[PDB]
Design a binder for this molecule. Sequence first.
Ligand SMILES: *C(=O)c1ccc(O[C@@H]2O[C@H](CO)[C@H](O)[C@H](O)[C@H]2O)cc1
Ligand SMILES: *C(=O)c1ccc(O[C@@H]2O[C@H](CO)[C@H](O)[C@H](O)[C@H]2O)cc1
Ligand SMILES: [Ca+2]
Ligand SMILES: [Ca+2]
Lengths: 121, 121
Amino acid sequence: AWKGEVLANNEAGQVTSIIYNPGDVITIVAAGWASYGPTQKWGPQGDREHPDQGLICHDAFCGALVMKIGNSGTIPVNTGLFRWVAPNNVQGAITLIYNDVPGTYGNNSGSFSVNIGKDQS
Amino acid sequence: AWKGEVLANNEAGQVTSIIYNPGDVITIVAAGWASYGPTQKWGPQGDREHPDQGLICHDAFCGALVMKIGNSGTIPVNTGLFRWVAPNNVQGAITLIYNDVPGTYGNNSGSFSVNIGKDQS
Ligand SMILES: *C(=O)c1ccc(O[C@@H]2O[C@H](CO)[C@H](O)[C@H](O)[C@H]2O)cc1
Ligand SMILES: *C(=O)c1ccc(O[C@@H]2O[C@H](CO)[C@H](O)[C@H](O)[C@H]2O)cc1
Ligand SMILES: [Ca+2]
Ligand SMILES: [Ca+2]
C-alpha cells in the first residue's frame, strides 16, 4: 500500500509506489483541501462551479484529484475509488495529479493526503 | 460490504448493513454533493467556511459525513477511512449521518454515495 501527499502545484504529479497490473483491484481514499488559485479551497472533487478552461482531465472538475496509470490518459479519482478495476489494457505505475490547466499550476496551493491499497482479488 | 446513499435531510441517519465488531478493519469511501441549506453544494468534508452553530459533530465541518457505531458518539468520516480500526469498546451497527445542527435537517438536499467494506485482518 502507499500513503503520501499530492501537492496542488505539482504539475508533473506525484508518482506512487503502486504498479497497477491487469486484474488488480484497488482502493483509494483521498482527503484534504487545495486551490487552483482562488482564496477558497476545495476537496478532492474540485470546484463544481468552475468552467473547464482546458483541464488535464475533462471528466473531473477543476481542482479534483485524477491519476494516470502507465501510459493512460487521465482518470478521475476524486474522493477515491472502492475496489476498482481499470479498463482493459491499462497498466503501470500510478501517478496522482491535481486537475488544472497546463501551465497554470504555479499559483496552486494545498495538497491532498492519499492512501492507495491493493484489495483481494 | 455495503453501498448506499446517505440523504443530507435524514436527521436520524442511514443505518447500514455493517456491524462493526472488535478487531474489524474497515474502509469507507464517500462521494457526492449535498447542502445544509444554501443553493451551493459541498462534498463529504462539508463547508470549511461555515461556523459551527451546534453541529452533531464538533470535529467535522457542517455538511460533512460522520458516523455512529452502535451507541458511540459521532465520529468524522469525511471522504472516508482507509483500513481503519475503532477505539476500544466501540462496536455495533454503523449509521452514517450528514453533519448539521439538530432540528435543521429539513432544508437539506442531495446525498453522498458511500461504500463500506471490511478489510482482511
Ligand atoms: C473567473 O473569472 C475565474 C476565477 C478564478 C480563476 O482561476 C484560474 O483558473 C485557471 C483554471 O481554470 C487556472 O488554475 C489559473 O491558475 C487560476 O488563476 C479563473 C477565472
Ligand atoms: C450566514 O451567512 C449563514 C448562516 C446559516 C446558513 O444556513 C443554515 O445553517 C445551519 C447550520 O449552521 C442549518 O443547516 C440551517 O438549516 C441553514 O439554513 C447559511 C448562511
Ligand atoms: Ca492554477
Ligand atoms: Ca440545514
